[PDB]
Design a protein around this ligand. Sequence first.
Ligand SMILES: CC(=O)N[C@@H]1[C@@H](O)[C@@H](O)[C@@H](CO)O[C@H]1O
Ligand SMILES: CC(=O)N[C@@H]1[C@@H](O)[C@@H](O)[C@@H](CO)O[C@H]1O
Ligand SMILES: CC(=O)N[C@@H]1[C@@H](O)[C@@H](O)[C@@H](CO)O[C@H]1O
Ligand SMILES: CC(=O)N[C@@H]1[C@@H](O)[C@@H](O)[C@@H](CO)O[C@H]1O
Lengths: 361, 361, 361, 361
Amino acid sequence: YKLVCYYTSWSQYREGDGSCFPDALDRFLCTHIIYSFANISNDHIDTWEWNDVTLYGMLNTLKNRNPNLKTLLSVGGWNFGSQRFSKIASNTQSRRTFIKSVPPFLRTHGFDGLDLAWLYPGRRDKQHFTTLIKEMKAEFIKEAQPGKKQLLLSAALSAGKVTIDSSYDIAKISQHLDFISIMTYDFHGAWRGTTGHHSPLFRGQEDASPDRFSNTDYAVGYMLRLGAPASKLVMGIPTFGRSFTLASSETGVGAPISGPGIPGRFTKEAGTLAYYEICDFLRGATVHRILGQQVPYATKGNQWVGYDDQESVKSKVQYLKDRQLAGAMVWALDLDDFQGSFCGQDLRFPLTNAIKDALAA
Amino acid sequence: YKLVCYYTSWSQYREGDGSCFPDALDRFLCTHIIYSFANISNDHIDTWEWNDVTLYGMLNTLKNRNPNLKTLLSVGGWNFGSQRFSKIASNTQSRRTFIKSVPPFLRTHGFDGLDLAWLYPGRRDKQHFTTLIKEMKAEFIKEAQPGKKQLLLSAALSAGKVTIDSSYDIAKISQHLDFISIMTYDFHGAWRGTTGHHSPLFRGQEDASPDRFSNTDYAVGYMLRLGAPASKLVMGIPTFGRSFTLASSETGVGAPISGPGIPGRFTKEAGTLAYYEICDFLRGATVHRILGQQVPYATKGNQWVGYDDQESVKSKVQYLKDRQLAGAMVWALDLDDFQGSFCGQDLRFPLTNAIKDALAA
Amino acid sequence: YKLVCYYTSWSQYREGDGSCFPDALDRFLCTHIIYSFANISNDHIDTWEWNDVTLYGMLNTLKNRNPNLKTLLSVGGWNFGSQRFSKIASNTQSRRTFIKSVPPFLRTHGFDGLDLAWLYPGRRDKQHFTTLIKEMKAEFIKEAQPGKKQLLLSAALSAGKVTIDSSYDIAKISQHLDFISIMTYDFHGAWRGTTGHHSPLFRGQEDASPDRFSNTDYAVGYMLRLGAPASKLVMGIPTFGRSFTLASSETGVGAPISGPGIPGRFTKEAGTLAYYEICDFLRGATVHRILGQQVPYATKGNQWVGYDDQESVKSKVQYLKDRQLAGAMVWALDLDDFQGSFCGQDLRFPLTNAIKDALAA
Amino acid sequence: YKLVCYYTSWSQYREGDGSCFPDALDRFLCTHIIYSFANISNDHIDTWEWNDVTLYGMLNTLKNRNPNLKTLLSVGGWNFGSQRFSKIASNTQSRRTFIKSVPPFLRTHGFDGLDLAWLYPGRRDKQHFTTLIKEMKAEFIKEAQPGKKQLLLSAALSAGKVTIDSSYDIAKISQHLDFISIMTYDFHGAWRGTTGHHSPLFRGQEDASPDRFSNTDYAVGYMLRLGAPASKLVMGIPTFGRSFTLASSETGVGAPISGPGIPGRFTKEAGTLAYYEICDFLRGATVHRILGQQVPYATKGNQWVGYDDQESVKSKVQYLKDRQLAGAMVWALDLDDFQGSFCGQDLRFPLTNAIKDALAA
Ligand SMILES: CC(=O)N[C@@H]1[C@@H](O)[C@@H](O)[C@@H](CO)O[C@H]1O
Ligand SMILES: CC(=O)N[C@@H]1[C@@H](O)[C@@H](O)[C@@H](CO)O[C@H]1O
Ligand SMILES: CC(=O)N[C@@H]1[C@@H](O)[C@@H](O)[C@@H](CO)O[C@H]1O
Ligand SMILES: CC(=O)N[C@@H]1[C@@H](O)[C@@H](O)[C@@H](CO)O[C@H]1O
């Protein structure tokens, strides 16, 4: 089983014990680690943060004691701009420059691979996206055709039905990619203005979600049906939760909300909490397991958070093993308890370790 | 929380330890016990079996130590002839004689109420059935008018979407009935000529069943939607399994079958097994929990049976409690381990006791 | 001990069995293989031959089956032109561009380091050469400072006293280089217009040479005295001979000549023969061991050639081991009998294997 | 070519097999044999050993079967005293008497000529030596005027540059001498307190000897340069070796010593060893060929000896033939294996037959 794990370069800047650099990662935890993100600039792949070269260094250092570890560089992400990635993929010169720039940059900086994270190609870009992928694989085959270890090509794809239907030719791109990470989290499948979990496994209670699409099971089945081979599909599992401010005494699934949850001290983003933040929040909170969805939420005063814990990630790994998927993708290493000193069990990366042990069973 | 339990009269004729009579029944187990079934003969309510009047008393003796206990007599059943019942409830005199005949016969034989089990009112009968339930509740209010204790009225309704849509005016009859026993088992939800569980709680893997309706969650939600109040709805939990003969080595959900399953020694009905026969079957067998349905099946040799156990009935009780339903209905006392000698715990009614325990916590 | 061996890119064009491509090289033969030469173009390190990129890869493939093997790329050579290397190294901006370009180029194309072959810095360029080496070494230390395998830096240096005195600050460049390959061959030690061996180990007969300086032993000792550590000094051993056309019946050392030797069938360069050509020539030749110089010459008709054989390279290896040098350097693989079919042993790389054997003993 | 061999008269007194007398000598081995040493007493040439006259007889017996063998007697030696030969040679009366005394004594005792072994003239005796040689030769020309066979005049000379510069007018004495024997052994060219070979053919490793001039090639080249005809120069070759006692684990050339080598059983002279003694030593010893010097040393335990073997003496002959020298000189028959029972092969005079063979090839 593959265990693909994202590290985000902006986690370095978080205050205090929140600050995360690649020298804090367990080198035997993951089969693959992906660094996010890289810019594209003058149509060439390029660094993002001032100190990426150092941080690339720290990441690849982990391969010294662990030969099997693979590292990829993810290009794109949320702050990149769907627009900008569009302009580049659609134009024929721009695309060639970009593609031609990739292998030298990866080799120069110690990476085994590229992860395309265009979030997201629009309706207009479906063919461009297929082309980009096909030609990038072609370039990687050429570059290594004299005897080398060939560079890996992956992509992070939406788990949302709408985006999958409009943006991705699944059968075509699946043939050229080495794996697909499906982002089975951040589903927006609650009734407007109410609580719901952002990463249910199963739909659960039929009449308590507006549709059947907003869950891990549906999206995994859909992508399999659309022609992605089970053996190339990696199933995304979050180490963050999505939080809401409650607007009444109701704390169930479907309760009214007034908006996103109060920011965490360290991640400082409304509507999100790192698992290490949730471990703090849980002291004095009530935990409930949403029966049909197989995932927990916690509530304390006017705050509600839907997240994953050791029991839930085990259920998720059972699912992915039963479907013979290739493995699990973890977003993100820097949002697990990587200091091992918030979750009260002195265990670094409790969630990721949980996934790893369930893959072994 | 009501806990409505069905005792069947034909269960007296099973060999050896199979034989069951109202004497073997724990008086504290249930709140309501429902005797099934009664005839309608020449438009008056009648007995069925030769020794019904004895068994009535054996049953109504149990109320001696227990004044909280209620009993009800169910009239109808599968053998009745759905034809015959429709005739009776369409004709204006028939219905009048019938309704008039019930209250004396009930007080006489010691019953606290009637349970309607017309299986099933078809197309045409929707209004007849609505009226029958309306005028029967008219009679039971008139009968107890001199300060008696009003007779209870209830009905066993289908959990099948088709049958509910064609047969029941749930908004109307729910105002007249005291509770509704919704038969959330014997779904026909599997792909054709393949294995499936007959009483799943949730739909489960979205791509592994033809429809979203053949599960307990759907049925309960549907009825809540159609007008039935939560405080009048009692959720059916089976103490029996449905079995199949497999046709290949595949033993999963949706494995090819060739027909129903070898009959039990004591129940002697192909495709059925009492819980106590299942305990016999389990020794030697692989149990697997269906992940999204939250129910087990067992397979051994060319036999596959989907059944409910202590873990699974507690989940269903957690489900019914979370929806604030009236309580749980059990089909049937004579099919749980009533000896206490099969399931190796030396415990009478393991499944029914699991349901009681969970209801109180 | 190191065994550094040069492969020359232009050897690929030699007719017939002379043609040598990197895939003919024994992957277990040498510790370090150096590819010569790379261009510098627009102050950037660059390819020379149109197929360099294919040949780099056939070389680097040799590492798959033997990971210990190291590869370096040599920049410069005799066709480069000393005066064009001057301007690059002496302009501060050219030199930075160049130095900046090397590590990406090396990593992109699979090489473990750079070999400098400036042939040769004049008196004017001594300091420039020193500076070039210091800065170039600093860059490799920087590029690697986060946990990479650091890039090797080596230099092919002249064994000629006059060039060493004019061009090299030995003490300073020795601390920065990882090894020095001293080109202890092609000495111009013969009395003008007379036969002499181009790679004597010692001076031999005192009154039969012009100078005491044109011999391996002098050049080694001189570099040691000047500050090159033994542990960084690699001693060049030729797999080629230098040939003369005799002008009389005299056939000894110091016999009159009329010009360089007739070209070989395959190397096609007057005054030079590959070892495999020498094997052909030895058929009907007389060989003599030069008494003080520990090396052979052969003569046949009007031709005379001073070369190395298995015995003579063995002696050279004894010598370098007794001086505790870092190992042997071989110019060049493509001039050894790489085919194995010329020296009537059916044994590929006869000279280099002999060198290898003597280093291991 | 000439082959000039010394027998030493004091070799009779050595124990057992060590004992050597002229009857032990093959008569076909040498072209000249030189009996050493004779005395000068009361300014007349005398005998030295009590039995000299017998030994001279046995020696001269050898010419009975061999018409071509030539014998000479050698006045002087180390034990004569430089101080005393000076006084005989510097006084016009002394010297005239000596000269005149010489021919009759030589005719009387069977000798074909005289060999001068003044070891050695000082600065102050240079011109006296020139005058002795000139006058002695004038005498021998005059004594032969009655149609006799002219007596042979030869001289043994130092190979050391200092002695040559102080003592010898090579150009002048060369015309009067029939041959010069150059003593190209017993060189004092080890760094002080260290091992060195006493008879190297060439200088060898440039920085592993104090001086350029303690070797055979330099001595020969120097004499030629000072005006000795090649056709009169006989190059000395030793059959003994010189031995040290090591002071350390180091056994190489220039290793630390503590004093001379353990005396041999038969020679009893610290720091010397006959070849027959060396043949025993070799059993259990390591032999190394010194690359520069074309000569072996042997070490075993705390002992180290530099000697000449069959290989080394063949090379010394090659050198003398290439330089067109008159022939070889051997010191000495009694230090070679004259028994023929020490060196394994059952051959008498291994080293001297080696010389002879090489002179004939
Ligand atoms: C610096 C960076 O990460 N992003 C730049 C962005 O700032 C913008 O200027 C663009 C050109 O319009 O190039 C991008 O890569
Ligand atoms: C099973 C049973 O009790 N059936 C009776 C029987 O008398 C039957 O013949 C019918 C007459 O039409 O009436 C039913 O109530
Ligand atoms: C062999 C080679 O590639 N060398 C080029 C040469 O082609 C030429 O253009 C020169 C211009 O001054 O630059 C060199 O590097
Ligand atoms: C007898 C002999 O062999 N040697 C003597 C020596 O002993 C010494 O007496 C000298 C004159 O003082 O004359 C030498 O020839």
